[PDB]
Design a binder for this molecule. Structure first.
Ligand code: OGA
Ligand code: MN
Length: 265
DNA sequence: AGAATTGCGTTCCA
DNA sequence: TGGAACGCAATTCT
């Protein structure tokens, strides 16, 4: 039916934009049974034909992956928490606020160096699999795009070391604040069988590797990251919260913006 | 001084 | 319903 034709349509855009051939490409529907193991190109869709998930292996040049990896590991070494955020954030507040890390070495490296380059591949990704996602991100405040140097208002930095079951991505969850599907990039170095992203309700395991992109709705599909016994799993999650369009913005950090939010009452 | 706890606040779901 | 949770600390303990 229109199932086989939709894959050829998506592959046509992805191959010509990324300038690479995606062999063994598969496609399913959100109602049907998902693949137990995913190691190649993969798309899932709804009844309308919209893309709910897209996984494109090895889209980032190896030099770019190695360069960002060594810098990420160098910065994270001098950090305490295993998570980092650049751009804006609206968690536990009635407003959007500048992340604390943005002024730090991690947030400066992301916003000034990483994000401007990754934004190009995010642009490649969105123009192929989800046009109305990039159409939404460009309707946001100009300050968000300038602060994060990316279509996505905020970026998550996940540093997953071996035997760290305490990490937030190691626990099954849904990012229930996401308004748009997130774009996920991976770095570091880890095995094919570990550090995969599993969608629990669908019993689907996506074996991600440094250099790959993952695009899916973290707000609808429950997901979790598997443990690694060796290596170092570093992932970047480019997302957009519902509050990025609803909640106001005072161009400041969290606690400082709370004082401003009370004075503007 | 640590550490341990509490605080400000939003949103969810077993 | 009340703990838990992509923040981010100031207060209160040993
Ligand atoms: O890192 C991954 O593969 C998935 N990450 C998340 O679900 C997250 O950061 O919320
Ligand atoms: Mn998530």
């Amino acid at each position: 039916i229109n199932k086989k034709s939709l894959l050829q349509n998506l592959l046509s855009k992805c191959k010509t934009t990324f300038q690479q051939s995606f062999t063994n490409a598969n496609i399913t529907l959100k109602d049907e049974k998902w693949l137990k193991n995913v190691r190649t190109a993969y798309f899932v869709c709804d009844h309308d034909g919209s893309v709910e998930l897209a996984y494109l292996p090895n889209v980032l040049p190896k030099e770019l992956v190695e360069e960002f990896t060594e810098k990420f590991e160098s910065i994270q070494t001098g950090r305490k928490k295993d998570t980092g955020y650049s751009g804006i954030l609206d968690n536990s507040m009635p407003f959007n606020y500048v992340t604390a890390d943005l002024s730090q070495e991690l947030g400066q490296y992301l916003s000034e160096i990483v994000n401007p380059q990754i934004n190009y591949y995010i642009s490649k990704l969105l123009t192929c699999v989800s046009s109305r996602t990039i159409n939404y991100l460009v309707s946001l405040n100009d300050s968000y795009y300038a602060l994060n140097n990316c279509l996505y208002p905020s970026t998550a930095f996940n540093s997953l070391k071996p035997s760290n079951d305490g990490h937030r991505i190691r626990k099954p969850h849904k990012d229930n604040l996401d308004i748009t599907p997130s774009s996920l990039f991976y770095f570091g170095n880890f095995q094919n069988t570990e550090g995969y992203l599993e969608l629990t309700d669908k019993n689907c395991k996506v074996f991600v590797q440094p250099g790959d992109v993952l695009f899916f709705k973290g707000n609808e599909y429950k997901h979790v990251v598997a443990n690694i016994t060796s290596g170092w799993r570093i992932g970047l999650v480019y997302f957009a919260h519902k509050g990025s369009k609803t909640k106001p913005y005072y161009e400041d950090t969290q606690k400082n913006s709370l004082k401003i939010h009370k004075e503007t009452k």
